[PDB]
C-alpha cells in the first residue's frame, strides 16, 4: 500500500507517511520541524 506525501491534503495526521504533519494552516501535511 501507499502513504501520504508532502504538500498533500490530509484529514488527519494519520495520512502523513513519514516526517510529515497535518497542518490545518496550509490545508495539507508539511515537513515536520526539528523542535
How far is 28 from 1, CA to CA, in rounded Å?
A: 20
DSSP 25: T
Experimental method: NMR
Contact 13, 3 (CB under 8 A): no
1 is written with which cell numbers? 500500500
Where along the chain do its domains lie? Answer: 1-35
E-strand stretches of 1-35: 20-23, 28-31
Grid cell locating 20: 510529515
Q: Which of 23, 24, 22, 21 minimizes the C-alpha distance to 32? A: 21
Q: Is 15 exposed, middle or buried (0-12, 13-18, 19+ CB in 10 A)?
A: middle
Whole-angstrom distance, CA of residue 20 vs CA of residue 12:
11
Beta bridge partners of 7: none
Place of cell 490545518: 24
Cβ atoms of 22 and 15 within 8 Å: the answer is: yes
* Residue 31 bridge partners (DSSP): 20
Amino acid at each position: 500500500s501507499e502513504c501520504g506525501k508532502f504538500m498533500w491534503k490530509c484529514k488527519n495526521s494519520n495520512d502523513c507517511c513519514k516526517d510529515l504533519v497535518c497542518s490545518s494552516r496550509w490545508k495539507w501535511c508539511v515537513l515536520a520541524s526539528p523542535f
